[PDB]
Structures are given as structure tokens and as C-alpha cells.
Paper text:
A pf is formed by head-to-tail stacking of αβ-tubulin heterodimers. A tubulin heterodimer with GTP-bound to β-tubulin is termed as GTP-tubulin, while that with GDP bound to β-tubulin is termed as GDP-tubulin.
In this work, we use single particle cryo-EM to analyze the structures of tubulin heterodimer in the GDP- and [name]-bound solution states without any other cofactors or depolymerizing reagents at resolutions ranging from 3.5 Å to 3.9 Å, revealing the authentic effect of nucleotide on tubulin heterodimer. Comparatively, only one major conformation has been found from the [name]-tubulin dataset and a 3D reconstruction is obtained at 3.5 Å resolution. Our cryo-EM strcutures show that both GDP- and [name]-tubulin heterodimer have a curvature of ~12° in solution, meaning that the nucleotide does not cause dramatic intra-dimer curvature changes. On the other hand, the relatively rigid conformation of [name]-tubulin is more conducive to the establishment of stable lateral interactions.
Author numbering:
A (entry chain A): 1 to 41, 46 to 438
B (entry chain B): 1 to 44, 47 to 360, 369 to 440
Amino acid sequence: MRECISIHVGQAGVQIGNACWELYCLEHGIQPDGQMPSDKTDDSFNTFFSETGAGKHVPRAVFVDLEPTVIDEVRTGTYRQLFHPEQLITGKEDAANNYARGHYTIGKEIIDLVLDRIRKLADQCTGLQGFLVFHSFGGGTGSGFTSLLMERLSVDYGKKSKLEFSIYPAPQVSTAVVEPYNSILTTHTTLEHSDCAFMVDNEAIYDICRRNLDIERPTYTNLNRLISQIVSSITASLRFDGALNVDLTEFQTNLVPYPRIHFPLATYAPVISAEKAYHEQLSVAEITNACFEPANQMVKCDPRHGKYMACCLLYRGDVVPKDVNAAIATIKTKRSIQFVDWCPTGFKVGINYQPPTVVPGGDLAKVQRAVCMLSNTTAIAEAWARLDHKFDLMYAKRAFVHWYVGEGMEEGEFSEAREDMAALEKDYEEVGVD
Amino acid sequence: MREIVHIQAGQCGNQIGAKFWEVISDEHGIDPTGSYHGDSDLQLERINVYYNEAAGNKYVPRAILVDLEPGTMDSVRSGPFGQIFRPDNFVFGQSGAGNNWAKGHYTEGAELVDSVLDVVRKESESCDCLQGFQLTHSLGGGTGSGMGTLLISKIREEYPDRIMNTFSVVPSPKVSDTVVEPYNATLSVHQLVENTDETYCIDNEALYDICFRTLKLTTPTYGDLNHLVSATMSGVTTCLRFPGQLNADLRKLAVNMVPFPRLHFFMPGFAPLTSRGSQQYRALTVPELTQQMFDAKNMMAACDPRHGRYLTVAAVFRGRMSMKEVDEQMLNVQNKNSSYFVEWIPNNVKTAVCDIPPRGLKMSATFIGNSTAIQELFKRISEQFTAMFRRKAFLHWYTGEGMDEMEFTEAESNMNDLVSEYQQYQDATA
Ligand SMILES: Nc1nc2c(ncn2[C@@H]2O[C@H](COP(=O)(O)CP(=O)(O)OP(=O)(O)O)[C@@H](O)[C@H]2O)c(=O)[nH]1
Ligand SMILES: Nc1nc2c(ncn2[C@@H]2O[C@H](COP(=O)(O)OP(=O)(O)OP(=O)(O)O)[C@@H](O)[C@H]2O)c(=O)[nH]1
């Protein structure tokens, strides 16, 4: 019933998938072998996990990557038996920070196996609902292979919803200087196929881990643990029997008012480090006010310049509806938040009575109540402006264009990608005026 | 993109590659027989990138040594790690061009290309996945330069899908006053720019002058120059020899570093400067080494990066680095000298970390930067070629092989066009 499949393309995608699946199996009482300890007899988690005859619940996910390092690190890691060998895919040739290699030269000889794995996974899924995609914009594989897979899946299924949790590159954790090319190209290619995508700015998350978690250096592990917490908070309503159930179709209906504007901005609160011997629990109104400052979102942008096309709230923890509505009413009094006249009111209520668990050993601290604020605002226009400004500075001298040229594609593709991003920015400023 | 194969040519190239592999085995805990004898598992994490697993957990270099003069064979078995290289990789000639590019590229080249191609195919289909090719050779030496250029051409027409790194040795008048040096150097750099992806210009002029001015070596022999080149070429290869998030493969190196196909020569930088006879140097702090990269003496190119402008730069740190302090220091260095960094390539300054430090010291850092500043190196090679060419002298040896001067003219024209490309990219701005 409403089964979903999560796809993890690239190193970033597979690592975030490992982290989020670890958190999921922790939360739903799923021990690493896959069996239910005195819990086989909520059925909401059956959408994400497939139960076999033996009783183990293998996740309905696939791990694909073009280098064999992280894949067999997962294979040799703590979860040998959690994932069957078929949803693990390797490759002797990597895109090597090249969208063109991961889209034309190297992608084509693996997408066939990828489609075979997806079909095999969906065979046991009666009520197919949608596709979850995890990848990285900066990475060559996570851009090219993701775009090619998105095109192939649109060709095959089509009307089925497709969700992207894509890593937005940041200079602090950057790996290639050619990342703006790959990011712009992949978001241009997947724009008409990604029904809704969640942009996670690694600079914002880096700063969150530096400050909120009081870490001298947010390594890849802490960043992944935090982003897995964010993704779990977002998708709990789909994986739990919430009162106001929201699914991928409802995600498109609510957080995506315009088909070309499908980048909701997420903001989950609170974030308290494991130390200090006390979390200093914040009230419902306190956490509600804590999800609106420009230092808590998933993308480094100022919401004041942005306009709220649609905003949704998802409380997940020890919360009561009365206090939730009181906090919403108090927030509505703020003039700092404004809704487009076309939208009736940018607010929604999502309540999950189940307490939010925290992954053991993580720097995060257990909190009784929590909430993630999902809003679609034109604040992301600032991030997109930074990205295409980098693209324009980068393309003014045809730097590194020959690497893309050698893999078939030419400067023309750069031309329509740049003009498509330009049209996207005029779409932003068009919907930004009432 | 999993295994690297090393290609060795020329007496200079043979010696530097042999003792480089000596150093690599020493810092990977590999005994002179081939068995692992280290302590940390990081050494064996990606040991297969250079070595090939043999019987009894032995590790053998994937290095193919070629040289017409058999003296290098006795020289390479004379030192340590002489027997680790398999004899089949010791395919050597008999004649010896002796500072003549054409003699070592036409006459005896055909007699060796077949065997070397056969053996390199042997490990190519004996390897799981070929990263690419790396070459250590001398541009001035006729035998080494000719054989290396022929290998480059044959492999490029045979393996166009694989990267081709070259650790070329630029001849210098101070180390050797051979008259025919500019001609072979120009022809070899033409063949390089036609069919290479990464090239580290290991010029001996910089080596000699920094040995004289810093290491106080009045007469630096081959040993000291080989010491510095082995240090820098191990420092650059730390990216490929240990796990890391930056510059995992040769293709990643090319993607991150070189923006233009005809602009791929590299400036090898590494700090500090340690001599063979000195080992009790103090532990230099991170700021000292970060501001040590700007110095021309610490640069292993006979250059001055102040003259040019940095396009892209890669830095890897080895030691007990304070990683946050490393990032803050590199950001401050980039901000303080933004004039030399191209503003039209955002975030072109990258840094990397390596837990294992080179043996002998603890504090070290390499600075592999791509800058147009080698434009003055090409000026010096151009002036050498013109001063030795405007009288149209010494061409009779080359014309005796049947080739005319038209190749010289076209090579000079392409090199001048490359210099013009350097100037145009340097003067470009947003
Ligand atoms: N940095 C170094 N430069 C060297 C070394 N040996 C020679 N050279 C320099 O390279 C140039 C000589 O070129 P080669 O030694 O490679 C002559 P080649 O090997 O091609 O033929 P044969 O030695 O006759 O077999 C000259 O400028 C030398 O000063 C060395 O061990 N290190
Ligand atoms: N948030 C987050 N971002 C990551 C993670 N790993 C990589 N990234 C981002 O991904 C970018 C590079 O992409 P890769 O991780 O190399 O993934 P890829 O596209 O498959 O490229 P290859 O792994 O080399 O094949 C980096 O600049 C990082 O910003 C991660 O674990 N978490």
C-alpha cells in the first residue's frame, strides 16, 4: 500500500542513504538483521521496508555508484545482511567530477542494470507511489547519472511522482572547481522531471554543525547524520500514520504550487548538541520561532527577500495540537512573513505524536518534541543567483569546456542550460511580485 | 580507473623513477623483497594503485624501464630495491643515441616499441582497471626524450581513453651545457603538448639553484637533484597513494586542474626543503609552510609565480595538521593575494589532508598549482632555441636521418602559439 522506492546515486547519495536508513531502522524498532523484536504484530513503515517470508525487512532502496569504494565499504560495514547484494551496484569507471562522463560516456552501460534493479524492486510493490532520489549536484556522477536516470524513469513510468534530496555543493566541502557546470546542467536536465526537489546547502549545514553542535570541524559523518535527521523529519509523515497524512502526490500539491518552482526550503528545529548534560528543552512556541531565523534553514538565504508561495509545518514529537495552533497564531502576527496573493494562506499543520529518536553515538541530543518547517519561498532565488553568477563567471572564458566537449556534448548544451536557468530566475521574480 | 602503470625512460628518468619507487616502498612499509612490513593499515589501503600483488603477499612495481645505454641497468641494480623490478621490465637497447632526439626516436625506437607495447599490454589486460600512464624522462637527453615521445605517441594512438601523466625533466645549461639541448627540448615539449594531459615540468635549473642557495651544495650531483625530485613527486602522488576526498584519480586531477587542453604543464611545489645529509630539522608550523609556497626557491620550477597568475592550485597536507587552522590559513592566504588568483574561476584554491607524513620528517605540504607563470620558462626555452637556431647550425645530424627542418619550424610555431595562449589567459579578466 503506497510503497515507495529510494534511489541513492553517487557517493553522497549512497552515504546519505546509509545514514537515513540507519536512523529509520533505529526509529521503527528495526534491528540491523531486519527482524522485528516483539514488534511484527504500525503498518505505515511497510511502504519503505519490504518484508520477506523469513521476517526480515530489507529496505526498498537501491545503491548505485560508479566507483567501488563506498559501495563495498557499505557491504563490508555494519549492515552486511541489511541490504541484499542485488541492490548494490559498482563500476570500474567513475565520472570523476564530470557531468558529461556520468551522463553519456559512462552512464549508459550502468543505467540498464539500474533499471533492472528498479523493476525488480517494484515487482513486489503493488501500489507504486513515487521515487526518492539522493545525489549530489557538485559530483559528476551524482549529476550526470542522476539526470540520465531521471530521463529514463520519466520515459518508463512517467506520471509517477519523483522526489530529489540533492546535495547542493559548498566551497567548504567542495571537491571540484567545475561543480557549478555539473549542478546547472543536471538541474536544467531534471527540471521537467523532478516533481519536487529539496535543496540542502552544505554551507548552511556546515555552519549548523559548527555552531549548534559546537564541533570544531563538521566532518562528512556529522553532516550526513544531521541531513539524515532532516530527511527523516520530512518523510516521517509518509512513513508514519500521521493524522494529516501527506504523501508524494500531496507533497506536489502543497509544496509545489507552480510546476517550474519545485524547490521547497526545509527548516527543522531544534538542534541541540549531545553534551551540556541537558538539552534545555524549548517550548512549542519557542521551537516554532526557532524555525524562522535565517540561521536554521537548509539553504543559505534570507526569507525576508523571499515570498512564501506555500509553507507547511510538521510537528514530530511530544506536541499537543492546542499549543501548535497557538504558536501558529503567534507566528502569523509577524510581518516578516508574507504570502503571495494567489496563495490563500501559507500554513499547514502536521502532528506526529511519536517521539523523535536520535541515532546512538551522534552529537545530537534527544528532544521530546520537534518540528520541521517546509516552505516554498523565493529566498532560494538568492542561492540560484549565486550559482548562475558563478556559472557566468566560469563560462566567460570557456574554462574546462573541452572536458565536456571530448565526451560528445558541446557548448550548445551549456547555452540552453544557462538560458533555462535565466528563465527560471525570471519565473522567481515574476511570482515574487503581487 | 583503478591501477596506475609507471613508464620509465632515459638515464635521468630511470634513476629518478627507481629511487622514487625506493622511497615509495620505504614510506609504504615495503621491504626490499616485496612483503609488507608496516604498522598502520592506511599503507595497504590503496597499495594496489602502484604495486601488483605477487605470490606470498609480495608486491612488485608496475614500472617499465627502457634505455639504450646498459649502464643504467648496473646503476639500478647497484642501489637498493634493484631486484624488485622484474627482468622483463628491463627492456634495454644497446646503441645509445647520445644527445640526439632523432637517433633515439627513429633508428632504435622501432626495435623497442614492439617489446614495450607488448609488455605494457601484458599488465594492462593483467590489471583490473587502468588509471592511466605516468612517465619519468629527461627532455634534454636525446635517448630518453626520443623514447619517451615515441611511447607517448604510441600509447596515445593505442589508449586514447586513458590519462597520460608525464614527469618531464627540462634540461638546464648549468647542470649540463650540451649544445643540442634546446632542439630536443622543443621537439619533446611539442610532442608533449600534442599528446599529454598532465605534465610536471621538473626543470633541473631550479633544482640546481635551490640546492646551491638553500642546501649549500656547491656541486650538486645527480643524488641531490634526484632527492628533491623524489620528494616532490612523492608529495604530488600522495593523492593517488592514500585515501582522500581530493584528487582521487588522474582523471580527477585533469578535471580539477587543467582548464584548457593545450595548457597542461604543472608547477611542482612542496615545503619544507630537506637535504639528504640533514634529518634533524625542526617541525615547521602550518603558517610557515603556507606562506612558504609563494617563495620561488620553494618552487621546483625555475620560475617566479609573481610574474604569472594562478589558474588552479592543489595542496595536500601531511602531518598532525590542525585541519580547521589549515582551512582558515589557506583561506586567509587566498584572500591576501587574490591578485594572482583568477577571479573568473571561483573557489579554484583547494586543500587536502594526508595523515601519513613522509618518512624522515613530520611537517610537510605539497603545492601543485597550475599557473601561467611558466610562460617565462617557455621564454627561456624559446630564446635558447633562437640563439642556437638563428645561425641555422647543428641541423645536419637531424637532417641525416631524412627529416627536414620543417618539423623544427612547426614545433617552434606551436610553442610560440602556446606562449601566446599563456599571455592571453594571463591578461584575461572578468
Ligand atoms: N635532475 C637530474 N637531471 C639529470 C640527471 N641526469 C642527467 N640529468 C640531466 O638530463 C640531461 C641528460 O639527459 P639524460 O641523462 O636523460 C641522457 P639519456 O638517458 O637520454 O641517454 P643515455 O644516458 O646515454 O643512456 C642533462 O641536463 C643532465 O644534467 C639526474 O640524475 N637528475
Ligand atoms: N552532505 C553531503 N555531501 C556530500 C557527501 N559526500 C559527498 N558530498 C558532496 O558531493 C560532492 C562530490 O560528489 P561525490 O561525493 O564525489 O559523488 P559522485 O557524483 O558520485 O562523484 P564520485 O564519487 O567521484 O564518483 C562534494 O563536493 C560534496 O560536497 C556526503 O556524505 N554528505
